[PDB]
């Protein structure tokens, strides 16, 4: 089998912006998560071929990972902080769909998501 093409990290027709919130997401939120003990499985797309995962890309049609989100923040791909926050949420949700509650990968995701939500509370309250 084959993996699909990864999600785009640049698009020459999509308008770009840097906001205070998008900056905080790169400089504070992603940085914290990236260095965490349980980050590594989320630092790049799920290689479903190499991990031999049954029907992964048949169940997960909107894949997402921190590797992608990191390059997207670095390339000023997003217009809004909400676009980025929904990428984080997609990634967690995906994990909780494909994997059994309480399995190791889910406990890792749950720890990252708790840390995510703590740092999302510190966001500048207005996007400028
Ligand atoms: C699936 C899935 N859904 O959301 C995410 C995120 C995943 C995901 C992503 C990457 C993964 N990478 C591995 C992995 C890559 N190398 N190794 C080390 C070694 C010695 C080859 O086993 C383990 N291993 C992974 N899983 C695959 C499924 O079962 C558990 C196994 C795992 C999880 C955590 C630690 C070790 C192994 C996993 C999983």
From Swiss-Prot:
The NET domain mediates interaction with a number of chromatin proteins involved in transcription regulation (NSD3, JMJD6, CHD4, GLTSCR1 and ATAD5). The chain holds residues 44 to 169 of 1362 of the full protein. Residues 17-123 form the Bromo domain. It is linked to Cornelia de Lange syndrome 6: A form of Cornelia de Lange syndrome, a clinically heterogeneous developmental disorder associated with malformations affecting multiple systems. It is characterized by facial dysmorphisms, abnormal hands and feet, growth delay, cognitive retardation, hirsutism, gastroesophageal dysfunction and cardiac, ophthalmologic and genitourinary anomalies. CDLS6 inheritance is autosomal dominant. A chromosomal aberration involving BRD4 is found in a rare, aggressive, and lethal carcinoma arising in midline organs of young people. Translocation t(15;19)(q14;p13) with NUTM1 which produces a BRD4-NUTM1 fusion protein. JQ1, a thieno-triazolo-1,4-diazepine derivative, and I-BET, a benzodiazepine derivative, have been tested on tumors with success. Treatment with GSK1210151A (I-BET151, a I-BET derivative) has strong effets on mixed lineage leukemia and promotes myeloid differentiation and leukemia stem-cell depletion. This is Bromodomain-containing protein 4. Phosphorylation by CK2 disrupt the intramolecular binding between the bromo domain 2 and the NPS region and promotes binding between the NPS and the BID regions, leading to activate the protein and promote binding to acetylated histones. In absence of phosphorylation, BRD4 does not localize to p53/TP53 target gene promoters, phosphorylation promoting recruitment to p53/TP53 target promoters. Changing residue 99 to A: Abolishes binding to acetylated histones. Chromatin reader protein that recognizes and binds acetylated histones and plays a key role in transmission of epigenetic memory across cell divisions and transcription regulation. Remains associated with acetylated chromatin throughout the entire cell cycle and provides epigenetic memory for postmitotic G1 gene transcription by preserving acetylated chromatin status and maintaining high-order chromatin structure. During interphase, plays a key role in regulating the transcription of signal-inducible genes by associating with the P-TEFb complex and recruiting it to promoters. Ubiquitously expressed. The record marks 99 as: Acetylated histone binding. There is a cross-link at residue 58 (Glycyl lysine isopeptide (Lys-Gly) (interchain with G-Cter in SUMO2)). Interacts with p53/TP53; the interaction is direct. Interacts (via CTD region) with CDK9 and CCNT1, acting as an associated component of P-TEFb complex. Interacts with RELA (when acetylated at 'Lys-310'). Interacts (via NET domain) with NSD3, CHD4, BICRA and ATAD5. The interaction with BICRA bridges BRD4 to the GBAF complex. Interacts (via NET domain) with JMJD6 (via JmjC and N-terminal domains); the interaction is stronger in presence of ssRNA and recruits JMJD6 on distal enhancers. Interacts with NSD3. Interacts with NIPBL. (Microbial infection) Interacts with bovine papillomavirus type 1 regulatory protein E2. This interactions may serve for the tethering of viral genomes to host mitotic chromosomes allowing successful partitioning of the viral genome during cell division. Transmembrane segments: none annotated. Belongs to the BET family. It is found in: Nucleus; Chromosome.
């Amino acid at each position: 089998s084959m993996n699909p093409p990864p999600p785009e990290t640049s698009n020459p027709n999509k308008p770009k912006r840097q906001t205070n919130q998008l900056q905080y997401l790169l400089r504070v939120v992603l940085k914290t998560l990236w260095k965490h003990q349980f980050a590594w499985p989320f630092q790049q797309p799920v290689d479903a071929v190499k991990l031999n995962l049954p029907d992964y890309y048949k169940i997960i049609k909107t894949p997402m990972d921190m590797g992608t989100i990191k390059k997207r923040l670095e390339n000023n791909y997003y217009w809004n902080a909400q676009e980025c926050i929904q990428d984080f949420n997609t990634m967690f949700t995906n994990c909780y769909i494909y994997n059994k509650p309480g399995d190791d990968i889910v406990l890792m995701a749950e720890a990252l998501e708790k840390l995510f939500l703590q740092k999302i509370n510190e966001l500048p309250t207005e996007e400028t």
